[PDB]
């Protein structure tokens, strides 16, 4: 991770006023020639940290 | 990819968390928030 | 609308 | 016949009546309401942002 400093600002902040406990990040898939393109284990995984 | 890397379970939340995201290509699109994570109960 | 990855 | 529903409930409220806005005025050591804050001052201008 970098060294420098951080100052993040607000976006937005809609009150909805429901209780939330769990969460779970959405990511994305991609479908090669070189892949099935199932919907299984043949995708295109990317790079991210 | 290598290998096939894409984990991406149920994780608890915990009041704040910092979502540090190094993306070149934006594969991480949205979130989603709620208690139950089915058609049961109110989710953002 | 649900598919799961193997 | 229209027949209204008002709910009060304990999320956050999103409706609500509309609100008025006072005419400009500048060099006078008077009071003012900006956003709930009454104060009592000359309002001049400024350079700083």
Same mark, same amino acid.
């Given at each position: 991770?970098?060294? $420098?400093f951080?100052?993040?600002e607000?976006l #937005?902040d809609?009150?909805?006023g429901?209780?939330?406990?769990?969460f779970?990040?959405?990511?994305?898939?991609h479908?090669?020639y070189?892949?099935?393109?199932?919907?299984?284990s043949?995708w295109?995984?990317?790079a991210a940290? | 990819?290598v290998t096939?890397?894409?984990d991406?379970?149920?994780?608890?939340?915990?009041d704040? #968390?910092?979502?540090?995201?190094?993306?070149?290509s934006?594969?991480?699109?949205?979130?989603i928030?709620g208690?139950?994570?089915?058609?049961?109960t109110?989710?953002l | 609308?649900?598919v799961?990855?193997? | 016949?229209?027949?209204?529903?008002?709910?009060l409930?304990?999320?956050?409220?999103?409706?609500?009546?509309?609100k008025?806005?006072?005419?400009? #005025?500048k060099?006078k050591?008077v009071?003012?309401?900006?956003?709930?804050?009454?104060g009592t $001052?000359?309002?001049?201008?400024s350079?700083?942002?």
């Amino acid at each position: 991770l970098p060294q $420098g400093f951080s100052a993040l600002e607000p976006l #937005v902040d809609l009150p909805i006023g429901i209780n939330i406990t769990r969460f779970q990040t959405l990511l994305a898939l991609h479908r090669s020639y070189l892949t099935p393109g199932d919907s299984s284990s043949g995708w295109t995984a990317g790079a991210a940290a | 990819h290598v290998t096939k890397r894409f984990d991406n379970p149920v994780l608890p939340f915990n009041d704040g #968390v910092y979502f540090a995201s190094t993306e070149k290509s934006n594969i991480i699109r949205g979130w989603i928030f709620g208690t139950t994570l089915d058609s049961k109960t109110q989710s953002l | 609308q649900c598919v799961n990855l193997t | 016949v229209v027949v209204l529903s008002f709910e009060l409930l304990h999320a956050p409220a999103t409706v609500c009546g509309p609100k008025k806005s006072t005419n400009l #005025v500048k060099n006078k050591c008077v009071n003012f309401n900006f956003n709930g804050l009454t104060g009592t $001052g000359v309002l001049t201008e400024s350079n700083k942002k």
